[PDB]
Structures are given as C-alpha cells and as structure tokens.
Nucleic acid binder design. Structure first.
Ligand SMILES: [Mg+2]
Ligand SMILES: [Mg+2]
Ligand SMILES: [Mg+2]
Ligand SMILES: [Mg+2]
Ligand SMILES: [Mg+2]
Ligand SMILES: [Mg+2]
Ligand SMILES: [Mg+2]
Ligand SMILES: [Mg+2]
Ligand SMILES: [Mg+2]
Ligand SMILES: [Mg+2]
Ligand SMILES: [Mg+2]
Ligand SMILES: [Mg+2]
Ligand SMILES: [Mg+2]
Ligand SMILES: [Mg+2]
Ligand SMILES: [Mg+2]
Ligand SMILES: [Mg+2]
Ligand SMILES: [Mg+2]
Ligand SMILES: [Mg+2]
Ligand SMILES: [Mg+2]
Ligand SMILES: [Mg+2]
Ligand SMILES: [Mg+2]
Ligand SMILES: [Mg+2]
Ligand SMILES: [Mg+2]
Ligand SMILES: [Mg+2]
Ligand SMILES: [Mg+2]
Ligand SMILES: [Mg+2]
Ligand SMILES: [Mg+2]
Ligand SMILES: [Mg+2]
Ligand SMILES: [Mg+2]
Ligand SMILES: [Mg+2]
Ligand SMILES: [Mg+2]
Ligand SMILES: [Mg+2]
Ligand SMILES: [Mg+2]
Ligand SMILES: [Mg+2]
Ligand SMILES: [Mg+2]
Ligand SMILES: [Mg+2]
Ligand SMILES: [Mg+2]
Ligand SMILES: [Mg+2]
Ligand SMILES: [Mg+2]
Ligand SMILES: [Mg+2]
Ligand SMILES: [Mg+2]
Ligand SMILES: [Mg+2]
Ligand SMILES: [Mg+2]
Ligand SMILES: [Mg+2]
Ligand SMILES: [Mg+2]
Ligand SMILES: [Mg+2]
Ligand SMILES: [Mg+2]
Ligand SMILES: [Mg+2]
Ligand SMILES: [Mg+2]
Ligand SMILES: [Mg+2]
Ligand SMILES: [Mg+2]
Ligand SMILES: [Zn+2]
Lengths: 187, 103, 53, 159, 148
RNA sequence: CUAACACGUGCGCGAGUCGGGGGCUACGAAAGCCGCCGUGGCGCAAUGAAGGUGAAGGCCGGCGGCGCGCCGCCGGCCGAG
RNA sequence: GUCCUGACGUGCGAAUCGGUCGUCCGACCUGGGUAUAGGGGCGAAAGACUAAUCGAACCAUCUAGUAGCUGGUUCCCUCCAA
RNA sequence: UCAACCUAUUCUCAAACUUUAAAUGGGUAAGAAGCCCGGCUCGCUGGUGUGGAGCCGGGCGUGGAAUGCGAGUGCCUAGUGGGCCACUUUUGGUAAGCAGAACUGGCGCUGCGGGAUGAACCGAACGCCGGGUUAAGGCGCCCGAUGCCGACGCUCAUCAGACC
RNA sequence: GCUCAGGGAGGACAGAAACCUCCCGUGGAGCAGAAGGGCAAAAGCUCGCUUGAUCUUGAUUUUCAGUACGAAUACAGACCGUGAAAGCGGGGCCUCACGAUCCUUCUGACCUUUUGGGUUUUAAGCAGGAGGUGUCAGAAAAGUUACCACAGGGAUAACUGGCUUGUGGCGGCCAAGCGUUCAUAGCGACGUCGCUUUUUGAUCCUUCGAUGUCGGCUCUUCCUAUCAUUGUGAAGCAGAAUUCACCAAGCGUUGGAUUGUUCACCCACUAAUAGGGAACGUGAGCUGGGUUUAGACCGUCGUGAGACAGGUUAGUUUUACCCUACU
RNA sequence: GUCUACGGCCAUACCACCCUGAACGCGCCCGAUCUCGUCUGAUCUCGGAAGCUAAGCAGGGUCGGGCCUGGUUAGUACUUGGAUGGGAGACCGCCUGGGAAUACCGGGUGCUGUAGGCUU
C-alpha cells in the first residue's frame, strides 16, 4: 500500500461563498475572472475576502479608516474594505475619503458625502482599477468580537485572563472560592 | 515544646521590632447571637431533628498551638496570632535546659 | 453532567409545569374583543372623551 | 505505586564522584553568566540550597535571569505529549557552560574571517560542513614483502 | 514498521514496496541506510543501470505532480537554473554526482519498479546470509535489470 | 417538543438594535402602521465586600524653591504610543 | 389427611382419585345471623389465615416513580476515523 | 602444640554493594532573532563615561551539515476511560492458554495469499476490472506447480520421520 | 574554637571497663527519627550573643489536568539577629511530619455597611491565623434474613471441561549400603530426570433470560500402570509356595454385617476378590438416605433478630407426540 | 635556578623512610610589661633577635605503597537491529553495527596565574 497518513489530506478552506445572495455571487463571478486572468494578488485576496463569513470579515469603522488612511504616504489612494464601513460617532471632522465596500451604513454614507468623499461598490472598483492598483486594502478588527474573551487558557488556571461564562455579573456569581485568597485558594 | 513567654519580634503597628508578652491563644465563648449560630438554631427549631451534620470521625490527636503576641510597649499593645507546627505537650517558659549534667 | 466550557445554569422546571402553562393563542381574539368593547363604550358615551377623564 | 518525593531515586545522581567529596572548588563560583548563555545542569549533593529537580539533571537550557547566588534558566521538559519550555531557578554550582555553543561561535568567527578574507582575493572557499565523504582512490604500497596469511586457530577448550 | 525505520524510509522516499531512489553516500547517509537495512536492498549502480532507470521509469516531480519525462523541456524548465537541460546531463549529474545532486534527485520522482522477475531468494534476511536485504555491492546491477 | 446557554453559520440594521406587551386600520387569529407607544431587554465601562471611584501625555515663556535642572500654577503650540 | 414419597402431573382437578390411615360424647362437627379491615384484623403460634393474592390484601391515583443496570434503536453513497 | 590475632596469598558471590563501566538511549547547538561597529539612557552595580541591561543609527547574504517535506494558528466537538497477543527486557509464582510492568508492532476496527483447521504467527493492508511479475509458502495425488534423465550424503524403526 | 568512631603505648589504688597524657586515626563517629545522599579549621562537639520559627506583594519548582493544598527554590520591600568583616539567616543539611467551602473563635485599621437622618451597643463585612474532615480533593451512619425481593453480572465464587503439576499417584538414572559372602536375585541412601490427570490445590476462559449440584441400583463401552487365567524369561527357583519381569485387556474380578456414604474395617467363598475413564459415565433412568429452602429440639456464640464444613426429626424429584441415535 | 604572600586545577601534589639546603625568606627560637586568653604564655594574642637547620618546609632518592596514564586481558564479556537459524528445553551460533573491566606489564611523580624578594 502507501504509508501516507490521510488526516490533513483535505484542505478546509472555502471555494464558494456560503451565502445564497445573488449580488455577492455576481461579485464572485467577476472577481473569479479577475484573479484568474490578472497577475495582481489584490484580486486573489479580495475574492478570498468576498468568500468569507461575516464573523471573519468584521465591520471596519470609519475611525480606523481615517487613521489608517492618514498614515503618511497614502494620500489620494482608495481604501478598500470587504466588510461594512460603519460610522464612528466619536470623530468630528472627516477628510476626503475614496472608499470601496460591500455595504456602507447610512450615516457613514451621509458623513463621507458631506465631507466630499465618494463611495464605490466592487463592480465600480473593478472598472476603476482592474489590477487593483492605487488601493489600500484594510480589514476590520477580527478579534474585536466579545466572544474571544472567553477563549484561550481557561479561568481557574494561573495567569489566565479569560472572561468566564456566568449568568449575571454580581457579588455572588463566582467571586468566592477560586478568586479569593481567604476563601480557599487564589489560582 | 518550650516557648519563652517573651519574644522580641516584629510589631505591625509600630513598624519595628519590639518585645512581646507571649501567651497561648484559647478559643473564646461561642456567642448565641452570631449569624450562623442563630441561623442554625432557627433551622433546628421545629421538626426534622438534626439538620447540619454532626462530625463523628475525629481522627487527629493534636492541634496547632497558637501564640498570642501582645506588644510590651505601653500605648501600642497590638496582638498577633503566631501559630507554629503542632505538638502534643506544650509549655511556656519553664526550665531552660542545660547541657552537661547528671540526671 | 456538564461538558467543557459553558455557563452553569439553574432552569426552574423542577416543578410539574405542564399542567399550568398559559398559552397566548387568544392574543388576537382578545385584542379584537377589547377594541370592540372600546368602540362600544366610546359610542355609548357619545360626545364625552373616549379616554375618560 | 512508587513514592512521589522530590529526591526519589537519586542515590547515584546527586552523589559526588568517587574521591571528589569535600569542599566545592571555587572556579564554579567565580564563573559569571550573562542572560542567554547556554547552560548545562548537573545537580550536586554537597550543597542543598537551590537544588535542580531530578527531571533536569543533564538537561541544557538558556539563562533568562541572573540573581545574587542563583540564575534562572529556561529548559525544555517533555511531559506526556507536549514540551514545556519552563522556568526554573538553580543555584550557581549545579551549572556549567555548554561548549556546544562555543564550538559554533568559533566556527562562525572563523567563517566570517575567511569570508571577509578571500572576498578581496576572489577565490571561493567552502563554508558548509559536508559530512565525511567516501575515501577517494589510493594506491597501497606493499613495499617488499607479501601480505601475512591468516587462518582461524583451532578450538582448544582452555577452560 | 518500527517507527524509527518508518521515519528514515519517509526521508529516503521509499514509501510503497519496490520503490527505488538514488542516494549519494556520506557518513550521515550510510548510517541512515543501515538503520533501515533489513528493509532495503541498495547497491552501486552501473551507468547502464542509471540509463535503464531514467529512460524506462524516470518521472519528474513538476509542480508536485508526476509528469513523465517525455521530452527535454520538462527537464529544462525545472533544472535550467542548475544548468542541466536535457536527459543526458541529468544522467551525467546523477552518475557523476555533481554539485546540484540534491535538487536533481529531488526532481526525479521515487522510482516505481515491478516485482522482480525470476524472484527474490529470501526477503527477510541479509544478502550475506543468502537473502536479499542489505548491501549488495555491485549486484544491484543484476536486480535492476529484472525489476524494470 | 418547550425553555436556558454556548459556538459555528446565513440575513437586516449597525453604536446601536428589537416591538415580542399594548394601540390604530373568506383566506385574515394573517398583513400593515405607531416613534412623545424605546417604557424596557441586551449593548455602548469597568472595578470594589462596601462607602465609592470610574479608562494619553509632552514641549515653550512668566512668577537644587533651595544645595516644589526639577519645576506648583498660569497663556501658546504639538497634540492620542 | 399418615404412608405408598401410589395414580395424575399440557390432569377429572391452578392440590383431585385409590388402598392404607387419625378421631368419632367432646377443647365435637356444621348451616344461617352478627362482630373484627391493611401497618390494621385474627392467630391452641405455622408468620398461618385475611375471596386461587400475605414476612403485610385488593382497587384507583400520584405515575410515563427513579435506575451508574440488561434489551432494542428504522434509507444509500463518499470522506476522515479512534 | 590448639587457638584467636596479624601479614601477604587463594575459592565463591550481591536487586536494595562498588573503584571501573559499555551498547541502546536523554538534552543543547549546527546564524539574519546572527555577527561587527558608532552612540545615548538608568533611580541597579559601581576605584574607574566601571559592570550589566535597554534603546537608537549603520555595515555585513556563500541563507552557513546531510535528507525529506508547503506550514502556523483558533473555535466547537462526539466517541472512549472492561482490553488482549507477540520478538526482546522483566516482577510474583514450581507452573499456567495465570496475574503485573517497559519498548515497539499487531488484534480489537481488517480484509486477502500462506501456516490443513485458527482474532494476534509469516507475507501483505482493499475502489471495479484485463495483462505481466512476485512476497511468505509450495510443486506424488487431493491441488495451480519438479512428469528436472536435478547434485551430495545420512537413515530401517515389530512406536520411523516430515517445516516459526 | 576544637576533632570524631576505633586502636596502640604509658600512668597510685585502676581491673576487661572511671580519669590523665602521647601517637596513629578520610570519617570507619555524629548530625532527633526510617533509609539514601551530604558533610572535617563543618553540617559534627563546646562556648558567646540571640529570636529570619517575624511583617508583605509577586514569580517559579514539585504530583500535575501542567489545577488546588502541603512542602520547597531564587528574588524584592522593610524591621532585626550575629560577626571585626565579607557574609550568613525569612525555621530544622536535603528528601515526609499533614487539611477545601459553610460555620465558630481570635487578631488588624480613628476602615466599610447596619438601610429616611444622627449618636451608641449589637450584627454583618475585608484580610490574617485556629478549631477538621486519617475514607487524608474533605457524607453525619449498626446488624440480620434460611420468609426474602428486584436490576443485572459468567467483569465474580460453588460443578465438569480447559493450560500447569506444587501436592497426590506412578516410573526411570547414578551406586554409598541391606541381602552371612555379593552394589544391582530382591531392594536402595544422599542426589537426580520424567510421565499421568483416577486426588487435592492454582487459575477464572466458557456457562448466572439456569448444563439439575452426593451416593447407591441398573447398563454398555473403553484403558493397562495385570490380581487371576494362556504362553515365556529371572531367582538367595530342590519340591510346594512365593517375589521380579515380557507379550497381553480375550475372559473374569463375588456374596454380605455397619455407615447416606465415596472411602474404611470385618465375616465367607474364591482362580482372583486389581486399579481406573466415558460432563468426578449414568435424576425427562430410578431412588431421595445425605446434604441444600420454609416447621422444629439441643450445645456453643450473640444483649437481639439469628449464625454454626456441629448433631438430630419431618420435608412435591415436572414434560417426549419433535429431529438424531439405537432396537 | 629558587622562595615568600595570595592562589587556580585539587595525589603526576598523598604516605613511610633516608640524604642535601648557599643568599633572601619561611621557620624553629627568647620572653609576658601592655592587648588578649588559658589549669598551664603549650595554643591564641602581644614584645623581640641570643642561637639553630634539629624539625617544619624546599629539592632529591627508594627494582617503595598509592595516584595519574598507556599496553595486555580482547574485538573477549556485553550489546542496537534481523532470520520460517540451531536446540525438547536451558541457552547457543550466525549477519548488520557499537564495544567494556580486573589480574599481569611498561612510562610519569605536580603544572601554573598575580604581586614581591634572593642568587652583590
Ligand atoms: Mg492502492
Ligand atoms: Mg483511512
Ligand atoms: Mg481531516
Ligand atoms: Mg420544639
Ligand atoms: Mg459527553
Ligand atoms: Mg515466469
Ligand atoms: Mg454567530
Ligand atoms: Mg401431610
Ligand atoms: Mg407422589
Ligand atoms: Mg404421564
Ligand atoms: Mg374421565
Ligand atoms: Mg377411637
Ligand atoms: Mg383498630
Ligand atoms: Mg384454631
Ligand atoms: Mg418462620
Ligand atoms: Mg410493606
Ligand atoms: Mg421511559
Ligand atoms: Mg456502577
Ligand atoms: Mg455523540
Ligand atoms: Mg519479523
Ligand atoms: Mg499478562
Ligand atoms: Mg487502526
Ligand atoms: Mg490484519
Ligand atoms: Mg498446523
Ligand atoms: Mg492479475
Ligand atoms: Mg499444499
Ligand atoms: Mg564554624
Ligand atoms: Mg531581606
Ligand atoms: Mg434599621
Ligand atoms: Mg430459621
Ligand atoms: Mg474440576
Ligand atoms: Mg511428585
Ligand atoms: Mg556389604
Ligand atoms: Mg469468566
Ligand atoms: Mg444457557
Ligand atoms: Mg440435559
Ligand atoms: Mg504392558
Ligand atoms: Mg447390600
Ligand atoms: Mg456424575
Ligand atoms: Mg428428575
Ligand atoms: Mg439424562
Ligand atoms: Mg432426605
Ligand atoms: Mg430446615
Ligand atoms: Mg446467651
Ligand atoms: Mg402413539
Ligand atoms: Mg613561648
Ligand atoms: Mg629544618
Ligand atoms: Mg634535615
Ligand atoms: Mg609505586
Ligand atoms: Mg611560583
Ligand atoms: Mg660571588
Ligand atoms: Zn507595639
């Protein structure tokens, strides 16, 4: 026979989006062609991010966009998020941005267009720059979700800063034996 | 064991080494109006008989002897429990022993 | 018998609750009952305010 | 079941060699350890303060901390299925430098000196260590005599 | 397979039964072969043996696929950077073990030979004790001829 | 099958979100609408047992203060690793 | 109701039949009326009897009692697999 | 004289003795996170801009053993927690198809050729087929194959012998 | 600051052993304990001074899930001890000497809450010890059932059968000796190698949705390790008798008294009264004397229900018409 | 060549006995008022210089014991891996590799750092 071990024989990654959306599948039908038929890997990574799940393409906010676009060198470039460009209310002035996203929330659309910016979709991005040149590809904070505070080294183990699953935060709800130094032990 | 009744040790209030009258800690009288005591008593009152478990299998002969360390210096007079490794027979300050003698 | 990681919880189902479960299937019948009663009251006190005093 | 003492089964491990009892020699104290010096462990029974556990006798680690009498080193212990790179604190005399790093440092400064030399000259030196190759072809001079004949000597039950 | 021997066979790229691989000899490699040595028969091949193996069964690992070496461009696109172009200087490098023998031999797929015509004399013993495993020195050139 | 929780996944909106309880207008006990019905839940802030407290700093000028080059405070500037 | 430990032992019978047996004027046998009710009755005492049920009747309900213990657990193909 | 003694000698041992002391094996290393310079900071250490550590700034690529190969990481998670056999090491036991361990491979979860028969042995691991060739084991007949003009000996059994 | 166990040589009573001195003395002593390591101007012995066996936050090791408690290791912040000083010391030279929540007690601060406000007792807190779970990661706990039950287990006993053969039985080998003489007619010590599964053990693989668990009676067949009979070889075989051996299981191997008996012993005949196997042959063949239900009495034990490889008495033995086998 | 003071590795330095030590040293030595400490100026401390290599110590010697380090023992014993090898077993042989220790016989007997003398 052959003594190859078939555990990791199959790659796990996606080849099609799980969504049954039709506009997203048209964007996939376009970027399949562009990444197959160009030699710029912006197209490969942007179809790889069109495929993803909405917990893997987190919402990038407009404060991150303003900061990471005002970092020096990248003036009049095109910000590209594959997720959802959301408003961030704790920022006052907004510079002229040139952004491209699947879906921009309504107050962020109003904010950028009052600042004098321009919103694009991905079909217009492919017309405007097919190899994706002149673009800054950004992604949202992926471990910004509240779930990742429950992950890692478990609570009740030394040097583990993990939020434990408790039904209501209070005085009585798991503050006593693993936590105190008088009540039992402190981990 | 033999412990002298005066230890020159740390004093947490004065922040420095001071002499200490050393005696032995003994448990105070149990108050009828502590919270757990009157909780237990009210839960016992009625029917059901014994409610909280009665410990029967006492298994060790010793208890850890605890020294009460009063500061000598007259306005401070702080106290600490300083308990040492357990021992069956225990005395305070009697017969500082001497080597090289007949029996 | 709790598994790896997850909120330990106290569901209050230790009583016999299936003999007493109030089910809301007469919600829209009760709303049309109330508003037909409200229309009858509002037209039987005819110029007075329907909301009462 | 066995006992789980800290020094179980270390009769011949922490004991000194034969006729090397007595006072510890003082070079082992006078050696100095930076952080990142690769360090062997060899526990010793003449001192008991700061004893490395018998899991670590012979293991080699890296210093991450040096204190007044002891260093802290980072050694790899394998427990059931994983390897833990863990911190221990060992007094200064259970410890030697490893010469395994020193031979590499010698070879690095030799490679760098004969790289910075014979770059101005133009020739190409070899820097990798190829392993011991097969023996190249060579004549054997049987100058004069015939080779000596051998034969198996017959069995004599000498017992 | 004892797991040490399984690992050394996985580094020698003998996975299936009756595969074959060229191996250059040095002190590391002879000890690697001798850990395995109840499971292999390894010898000193002739130039005709290297020719029979390359032309008859020699396939190339291109884009980690097994494309049969039909014409010289399949060799030249993958080893032109080491300045061997055709099958002839492929065979020359492998026979006169060259500088880029590592990448030439890693280019060639592990050879897949048929079962020996005529038959093995005994599998589970060494060649010295009248068997087949071990170190036939030159007598691999009587076993390649009937295994391909 | 109902409830609770966890994680993954698709969908809408996105620092907000949700009318489920109430109200207004055959299939329809559906559907729509409310917005001064967001009361409220969850989230946007944690920590402490509790009283409670509650998430950048620097540079410039003026007044060892002496055996607060630090500066206590004022006016300007850069300004969020 | 002794013994045959006979018959029968899917019987005539969920305890019957045959021969042999005990007692047969007294603590005798028996009909009907009445009393005692389940953790109770009643017992010349065997834990017997209490409607073919007795070291705690029967009927309904709680009730689908619980069980780390047995039994079972319904279509195909492909992949990974202790 | 016979003794202890004492001094050189001699015979036999040791799981819980040892001067010596293998094989197998256990860590570490085989560079770019490394070297070599120039310089700032420190409340630590300080005869000593000492020692150490941290920060800047620059220059070095022959990628510094062989061999093989794309890797790293994060959730959620069923089932399992009665095991057994074998080469070797080995404990109790007289011994066991007995009980108890170590390494590795199997069986269990696994077919298929061989060992007549067989969970574990020898070979060998499987999609459905055609051709060729083998492995272990065979070739009087059952039964494919010695129906070779096979080679060299030993062996008579009134209980022959015949394959892990 | 000193050197220890032991030994040698001296010395009034003095000795085998009191004490003084000299010399050898690598640990043969001591260090609390069990052992292992460790140790000689010390870790031992004797002094002097003492309380680092104290207050405090972190990290790490150890068993480990890489979690607790215990125990330990480097540090760090004071407050000290000692030494002239370097330093050493936060318990015992190292390896064991020990304990969660809840509850109670004590200690600590010009502490927090005590509920509309204030004061004051009380109570609740916060941290640090202690009271303890020895089944030691931590319930509060006496029996009996033969009147017994239920869920299961052949994971686990009592049968047979299996692997093994200690023990039982049986047979060799070597030859010190018995056999007046003589190792070997007939035996055989000290040793030693086996065979059998008719004893007992050992094991627990099969059976717990049941394989009917003692004997006897009846009945067939088988083995040979042969008691007799047929034929032979050997004798310390004169005869008669008897011992040992070979081929050999064809044909026999009984009647009874006692006992439930298997066994055992005895009476009598005998040619001989040999041994055994077939699920310790044989209960849908019988018997039920025994053990092995429920009723009872006795002894001992137990306060008692009741228990007794202790005795004794009474105590249901079911079904063939199927297939196979045989007649 | 050599010594003292401080040493490093700790016997190629130890131990027993014998011989030789010029100069500087190191010593032995002479004392006890003061410092100090004892039964005792033996020790420790303190003040010295009349004498002596006698001892220490230094160098050297012994068909010396020891130690160190080679040969032999020996490719022996043992041993990773392998066979449908042998043997009733015990154990043994073989292939692929690795490879010890006594007895016995030779060689060696301190090297050396920092500071300061001596050999006018
Ligand atoms: Mg295949
Ligand atoms: Mg598979
Ligand atoms: Mg997989
Ligand atoms: Mg009352
Ligand atoms: Mg589960
Ligand atoms: Mg053929
Ligand atoms: Mg989700
Ligand atoms: Mg009757
Ligand atoms: Mg009857
Ligand atoms: Mg009948
Ligand atoms: Mg009739
Ligand atoms: Mg009568
Ligand atoms: Mg009554
Ligand atoms: Mg009556
Ligand atoms: Mg009864
Ligand atoms: Mg009852
Ligand atoms: Mg059910
Ligand atoms: Mg259970
Ligand atoms: Mg499941
Ligand atoms: Mg094999
Ligand atoms: Mg076993
Ligand atoms: Mg498997
Ligand atoms: Mg298989
Ligand atoms: Mg067979
Ligand atoms: Mg075929
Ligand atoms: Mg055949
Ligand atoms: Mg001392
Ligand atoms: Mg300190
Ligand atoms: Mg109040
Ligand atoms: Mg009874
Ligand atoms: Mg039996
Ligand atoms: Mg026997
Ligand atoms: Mg005689
Ligand atoms: Mg069983
Ligand atoms: Mg059955
Ligand atoms: Mg039957
Ligand atoms: Mg016979
Ligand atoms: Mg009779
Ligand atoms: Mg029977
Ligand atoms: Mg019967
Ligand atoms: Mg029968
Ligand atoms: Mg009976
Ligand atoms: Mg009875
Ligand atoms: Mg009594
Ligand atoms: Mg009929
Ligand atoms: Mg004097
Ligand atoms: Mg002298
Ligand atoms: Mg002299
Ligand atoms: Mg000598
Ligand atoms: Mg010198
Ligand atoms: Mg002169
Ligand atoms: Zn005080």
């Amino acid at each position: 026979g052959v003594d190859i071990r078939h555990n990791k024989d199959r790659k796990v990654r996606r080849k099609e989006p799980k969504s049954q959306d039709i506009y997203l599948r048209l964007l996939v039908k376009l970027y399949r062609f562009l990444a197959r038929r160009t030699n710029s890997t912006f197209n490969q990574v942007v179809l790889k991010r069109l495929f993803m799940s909405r917990t893997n393409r987190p919402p990038l906010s407009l404060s991150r966009m303003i900061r990471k676009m005002k970092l020096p060198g990248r003036e009049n470039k095109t910000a590209v998020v594959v997720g959802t460009v959301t408003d961030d209310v704790r920022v006052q002035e907004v510079p002229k941005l040139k952004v491209c996203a699947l879906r921009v929330t309504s107050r962020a659309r109003s904010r950028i267009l009052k600042a004098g910016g321009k919103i694009l979709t991905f079909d217009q991005l492919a017309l405007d720059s097919p190899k994706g040149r002149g673009t800054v590809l950004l992604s949202g904070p992926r471990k910004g979700r509240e779930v990742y505070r429950h992950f890692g080294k478990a609570p009740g183990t030394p040097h583990s800063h993990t939020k434990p699953y408790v039904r209501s935060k209070g005085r009585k709800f798991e503050r006593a034996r693993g936590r105190r130094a008088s009540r039992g032990y402190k981990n | 064991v033999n412990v002298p009744k005066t230890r020159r040790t740390f004093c947490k209030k004065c922040g420095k080494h001071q002499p200490h009258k050393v005696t032995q800690y003994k448990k105070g009288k149990d108050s009828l109006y502590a919270q757990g005591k009157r909780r237990y008593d009210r839960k016992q009152s009625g029917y059901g008989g014994q409610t909280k478990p009665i410990f029967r299998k006492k298994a060790k002969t010793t208890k850890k002897i605890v020294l009460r360390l009063e500061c000598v210096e007259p306005n401070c007079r702080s106290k600490r429990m300083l308990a040492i490794k357990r021992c069956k027979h225990f005395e305070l300050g009697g017969d500082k022993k001497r080597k090289g003698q007949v029996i | 018998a709790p598994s790896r990681n997850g909120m330990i919880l106290k569901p209050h189902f230790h009583k016999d609750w299936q003999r007493r479960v109030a089910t809301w299937f007469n919600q829209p019948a009760r709303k049309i009952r109330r508003r037909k009663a409200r229309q009858a009251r509002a037209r039987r006190i005819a110029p007075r305010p329907a909301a009462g005093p | 079941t066995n006992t789980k003492g800290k020094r179980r089964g270390t009769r011949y491990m922490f004991s000194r060699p034969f006729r090397k009892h007595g006072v510890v020699p003082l070079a082992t104290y006078m050696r100095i350890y930076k952080k990142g010096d690769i360090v062997d462990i060899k526990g010793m029974g003449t001192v008991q303060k700061g004893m490395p556990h018998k899991c670590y006798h012979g293991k080699t680690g890296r210093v991450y901390n040096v204190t007044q009498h002891a260093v802290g080193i980072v050694v790899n212990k394998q427990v059931k299925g994983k390897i833990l790179a863990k911190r221990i604190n060992v007094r200064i005399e259970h410890i030697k430098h490893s010469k395994s790093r020193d031979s590499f440092l010698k070879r690095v400064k030799e490679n760098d000196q004969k790289k910075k030399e014979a770059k101005e000259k133009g020739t190409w030196v070899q820097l990798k260590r190829q392993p011991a190759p097969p023996r190249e072809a060579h004549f054997v001079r049987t100058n004069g005599k015939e080779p000596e004949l051998l034969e198996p000597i017959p069995y004599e039950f000498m017992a | 397979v004892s797991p040490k021997v399984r690992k050394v066979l996985q580094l020698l790229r003998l996975r299936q039964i009756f595969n074959g691989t060229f191996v250059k000899l040095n002190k590391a490699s002879i000890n690697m072969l001798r850990i395995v040595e109840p499971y292999i028969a390894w010898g000193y091949p002739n130039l005709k043996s290297v020719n029979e193996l390359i032309y008859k069964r020699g396939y190339g690992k291109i884009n980690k696929k097994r494309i049969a070496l039909t014409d010289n461009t399949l060799i030249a696109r993958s080893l032109g950077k080491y300045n061997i172009i055709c099958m002839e200087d492929l065979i020359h490098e492998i026979y006169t073990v060259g500088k880029h023998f590592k990448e030439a031999n890693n280019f060639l797929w592990p050879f897949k030979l048929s079962s020996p015509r005529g038959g093995m004399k005994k599998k589970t013993t060494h060649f010295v004790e009248g068997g087949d495993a071990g170190n036939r020195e030159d007598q691999i050139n009587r076993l390649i001829r009937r295994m391909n």
